[PDB]
Design a protein around this ligand. Structure first.
Ligand SMILES: NC(=O)c1ccc[n+]([C@@H]2O[C@H](COP(=O)([O-])OP(=O)(O)OC[C@H]3O[C@@H](n4cnc5c(N)ncnc54)[C@H](OP(=O)(O)O)[C@@H]3O)[C@@H](O)[C@H]2O)c1
Length: 283
């Protein structure tokens, strides 16, 4: 079973990509960050996820340096603050992102979350960037099932190419409603915080005996086990962030893992799937 995802105008991207939140904050780390991204590309991870938010442009500048001369090898995803996502301001947000990335187009551009602009106006603005050639496709982030239904209802809202939401073993709420909805509409989901921020989100995911034993039993690390879990089913593209080369190399290698039913059942007993609607986890 191929560990790829149909994503925008790309027929198949690898199901693990590269996050950039917390890159670009410190000048002393820029070279290390550039190297971690290039390592990911060198290991076949092509999707890079960033945002105008991240270090106020800084992460985008890091990405732009990392991808110099490699633009055709990568699938670039950035995001626009909702307060920019309207007729007036959208072009400037997009143009500023493109300047920092030093590329003339994005593969995907996401509404970072839903603000006060009516969705119809954001959709029209995204469609204009598509017609101009500045973005190949648009999508959204942090939209729950109700918001996705509202979007679908808008003119051209069905062109939405992805929804990026929080998903990991210890926060599975999207499995009740949102993922099935996405699955029904052939919409790929981008899973952010797929490592729960290396466990910092949920106390003891990493420090868990049965998960530690399970990873040891196949000679993988817990992080790899958690990533393979996130991408176990089609239609989900995980975007772990790694500034460490050792970590990027691990993360790419998690594309080669096949979890058994026995293993997946054990994991469900440790962190059961949701049996009701849950508010969309975000962070
Ligand atoms: N749309 C949104 O609202 C939203 C919100 C949050 C995040 N995001 C996106 O999603 C991405 C992923 O989420 P995240 O950065 O919040 O958290 P994450 O990817 O779940 O975890 C990042 C942490 O995991 C560590 N790590 C990575 N690979 C590892 C490995 N193999 N072994 C051990 N530790 C490992 C990293 O350390 P090192 O860096 O030192 O390797 C980092 O400290 C973000 O970077 C961003 O692109 C989007």
């Amino acid at each position: 079973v191929k560990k790829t995802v149909r994503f925008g105008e790309q027929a198949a991207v690898p199901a693990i990509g590269l996050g950039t939140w917390y890159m670009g904050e410190h000048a002393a780390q820029r070279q290390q960050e550039v190297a971690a991204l290039r390592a990911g590309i060198d290991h076949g991870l092509t999707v890079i996820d960033t945002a105008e938010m991240y270090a106020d442009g800084g992460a985008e500048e890091v990405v732009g340096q990392a991808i110099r001369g490699l633009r055709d090898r990568v699938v670039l995803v950035s995001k626009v603050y909702p307060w920019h996502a309207g007729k007036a301001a959208m072009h400037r947000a997009c143009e500023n992102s493109l300047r920092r990335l030093q590329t003339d187009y994005l593969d995907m551009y996401l509404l970072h979350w839903r603000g006060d602009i009516p969705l119809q106006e954001t959709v029209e603005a995204m469609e204009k960037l598509v017609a101009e050639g500045k973005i190949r496709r648009w999508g959204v982030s942090n939209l729950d099932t109700e918001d996705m239904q509202a979007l679908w209802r808008t003119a051209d809202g069905e062109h939405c190419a992805t929804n990026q939401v929080l998903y990991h073993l210890a926060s599975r709420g999207i499995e009740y409603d949102l993922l099935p909805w996405c699955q029904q509409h052939s919409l790929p989901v981008m899973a952010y915080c797929p490592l729960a921020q290396a466990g910092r989100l949920r106390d003891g995911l990493f420090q868990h005996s049965d998960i530690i034993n399970m990873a040891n039993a196949r000679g993988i690390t817990v992080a790899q086990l958690l990533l393979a879990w996130v991408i176990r089913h089609p239609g989900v593209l995980a975007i772990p962030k790694a500034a460490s080369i050792e970590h990027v190399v691990q993360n790419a290698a998690a594309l080669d893992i096949v979890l058994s039913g026995e293993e997946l059942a054990q994991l469900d007993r440790l962190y059961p799937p949701p049996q009701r609607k849950n508010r969309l986890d975000m962070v």
